[PDB]
Design a protein around this motif. Structure first.
Motif, PDB file in Angstrom:
ATOM      1  N   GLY A   1       0.771  -1.235   0.000  1.00 44.98           N
ATOM      2  CA  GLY A   1       0.000   0.000   0.000  1.00 44.98           C
ATOM      3  C   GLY A   1       0.787   1.261   0.000  1.00 44.98           C
ATOM      4  O   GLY A   1       0.199   2.326  -0.078  1.00 44.98           O
ATOM      5  N   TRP A   2       2.116   1.138   0.052  1.00 39.92           N
ATOM      6  CA  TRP A   2       3.019   2.289   0.038  1.00 39.92           C
ATOM      7  C   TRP A   2       3.701   2.494  -1.319  1.00 39.92           C
ATOM      8  O   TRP A   2       3.944   1.537  -2.057  1.00 39.92           O
ATOM      9  N   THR A   3       4.020   3.742  -1.627  1.00 39.99           N
ATOM     10  CA  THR A   3       4.691   4.088  -2.877  1.00 39.99           C
ATOM     11  C   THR A   3       6.206   3.720  -2.938  1.00 39.99           C
ATOM     12  O   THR A   3       6.656   3.084  -3.889  1.00 39.99           O
ATOM     13  N   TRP A   4       6.971   4.098  -1.909  1.00 45.62           N
ATOM     14  CA  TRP A   4       8.428   3.888  -1.919  1.00 45.62           C
ATOM     15  C   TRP A   4       8.754   3.210  -0.593  1.00 45.62           C
ATOM     16  O   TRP A   4       8.173   3.541   0.454  1.00 45.62           O
TER      17      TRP A   4
ATOM     18  N   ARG B   1       0.529   6.976   0.158  1.00 43.90           N
ATOM     19  CA  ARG B   1      -0.242   5.824  -0.291  1.00 43.90           C
ATOM     20  C   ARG B   1       0.115   5.430  -1.749  1.00 43.90           C
ATOM     21  O   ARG B   1       0.414   6.286  -2.574  1.00 43.90           O
ATOM     22  N   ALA B   2       0.065   4.149  -2.039  1.00 48.41           N
ATOM     23  CA  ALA B   2       0.317   3.660  -3.389  1.00 48.41           C
ATOM     24  C   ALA B   2      -0.812   4.225  -4.291  1.00 48.41           C
ATOM     25  O   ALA B   2      -1.951   4.442  -3.845  1.00 48.41           O
ATOM     26  N   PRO B   3      -0.502   4.496  -5.561  1.00 52.16           N
ATOM     27  CA  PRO B   3      -1.527   5.042  -6.461  1.00 52.16           C
ATOM     28  C   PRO B   3      -2.691   4.095  -6.768  1.00 52.16           C
ATOM     29  O   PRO B   3      -3.752   4.529  -7.191  1.00 52.16           O
ATOM     30  N   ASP B   4      -2.526   2.818  -6.515  1.00 53.99           N
ATOM     31  CA  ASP B   4      -3.582   1.867  -6.785  1.00 53.99           C
ATOM     32  C   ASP B   4      -4.423   1.532  -5.547  1.00 53.99           C
ATOM     33  O   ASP B   4      -4.139   2.003  -4.442  1.00 53.99           O
TER      34      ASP B   4
ATOM     35  N   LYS C   1      -6.519   2.483   1.840  1.00 57.63           N
ATOM     36  CA  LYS C   1      -6.662   2.650   3.290  1.00 57.63           C
ATOM     37  C   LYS C   1      -5.824   3.833   3.800  1.00 57.63           C
ATOM     38  O   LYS C   1      -6.138   4.435   4.848  1.00 57.63           O
ATOM     39  N   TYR C   2      -4.790   4.205   3.046  1.00 57.62           N
ATOM     40  CA  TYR C   2      -3.905   5.256   3.512  1.00 57.62           C
ATOM     41  C   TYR C   2      -4.323   6.617   3.131  1.00 57.62           C
ATOM     42  O   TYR C   2      -3.604   7.576   3.404  1.00 57.62           O
ATOM     43  N   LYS C   3      -5.515   6.701   2.519  1.00 57.09           N
ATOM     44  CA  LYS C   3      -6.113   7.985   2.209  1.00 57.09           C
ATOM     45  C   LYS C   3      -6.498   8.623   3.575  1.00 57.09           C
ATOM     46  O   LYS C   3      -6.563   9.854   3.686  1.00 57.09           O
TER      47      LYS C   3
END
Length: 329
Positions: free
Chosen positions: A101-104, A111-114, A119-121
């Protein structure tokens, strides 16, 4: 009480390991000031993708952040989850795309773009909680100033700083995100590739851009803070070679962040432009770090924006109150 430690843990000077947080074993380095005159201001510097926590604290090239303890600051540098409690680990597993769920991967900073990141919104994430818990715990053994807790970082660490200031402004008095990402998105929260993202921002450089670094949507209000955003100039870019190549350009990201924080009335934003590229500020390092922290310490949590006074930074820097005006023409 503002200060407490998790069951079974007691903070000490130097390296701390096995701090329990959201079920993980976390680590951090404590460098106390020689005297905590009834309450020391706090600096929490964070590395990015390839530098070790100990480098950031002790090596000039990486910041020499431990030096701030010589000037009255309690310095606490947190270890990234991926470094598995090793403060001497530079890149390793940290240099990688995010997961779960994370980008890097270095820091749970956006939050990851997908769908995996939906949930991280709203959920700040494990790192935002760790950083607060960490400081609250050190505060049981040394006297800290609750109104002068500042965090900062370079690259992924600046990104993580932006996320913590957006999600937990009730805690931090502010911070210094140096060349951090904003993961800009369209107004509806959707992400388009790097190139289009760069262009859409350059097309509307004063617009408040939403971003995966923060809550979706971004807060219309935050607790009082002072934020110093630092951009390293034309060469402030992140390029990791083929096949990914150039994947972050910090011109639009520090513009976007400066726009947002400058738009929040009870938050003082300082836009600093430097010329060192993408790494810890290299010109007059020690002086810059101390200038920046004393500047934040001059505006304790709850100060009125109208009373903030910006003094001149060391040579190599140009700062202005408000949003950047030097990124786009």
């Amino acid at each position: 009480s503002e200060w407490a430690c998790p069951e079974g843990f007691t903070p000490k000077a130097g390296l701390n390991t096995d701090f329990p947080s959201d079920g993980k074993k976390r680590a951090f380095v404590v460098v106390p000031p020689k005297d905590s005159a009834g309450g020391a201001p706090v600096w929490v510097p964070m590395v990015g993708t390839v530098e070790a926590t100990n480098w950031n604290l002790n090596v000039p090239r990486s910041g020499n952040n431990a030096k701030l303890a010589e000037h009255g600051y309690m310095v606490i540098s947190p270890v990234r989850q991926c470094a598995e409690q090793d403060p001497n680990l530079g890149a390793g597993a940290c240099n990688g795309v995010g997961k779960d769920g994370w980008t890097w991967n270095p820091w749970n900073d956006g939050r990851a773009p997908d769908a995996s990141g939906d949930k991280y919104k709203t959920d700040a994430g494990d790192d935002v909680r760790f950083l607060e818990a960490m400081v609250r715990c050190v505060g049981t053994k040394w006297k800290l100033d609750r109104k002068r807790l500042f965090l900062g970082g370079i690259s992924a660490g600046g990104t993580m700083t932006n996320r913590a200031l957006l999600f937990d402004s009730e805690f931090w008095a502010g911070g210094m995100p140096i060349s951090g990402e904003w993961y800009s998105t369209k107004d509806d929260g959707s992400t388009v590739p790097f190139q289009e993202t760069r262009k859409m921002v350059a097309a509307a450089p004063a617009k408040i851009w939403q971003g995966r670094v923060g809550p979706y949507p971004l807060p219309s209000k935050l607790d009082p803070m002072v934020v110093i955003t630092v951009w390293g100039g034309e060469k402030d870019l992140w390029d990791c070679g083929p096949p990914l190549g150039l994947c972050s350009d910090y011109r639009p990201t520090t513009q976007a962040s400066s726009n947002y924080f400058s738009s929040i009335s009870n938050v003082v934003h300082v836009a600093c432009s430097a010329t060192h590229g993408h790494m810890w500020p290299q010109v007059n390092t020690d002086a810059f770090n101390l200038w920046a922290l004393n500047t934040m310490a001059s505006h304790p949590k709850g100060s009125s924006p109208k009373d903030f006074k910006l003094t001149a930074p060391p040579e190599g820097y140009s700062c202005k109150i408000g949003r950047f005006t030097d990124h786009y023409k």
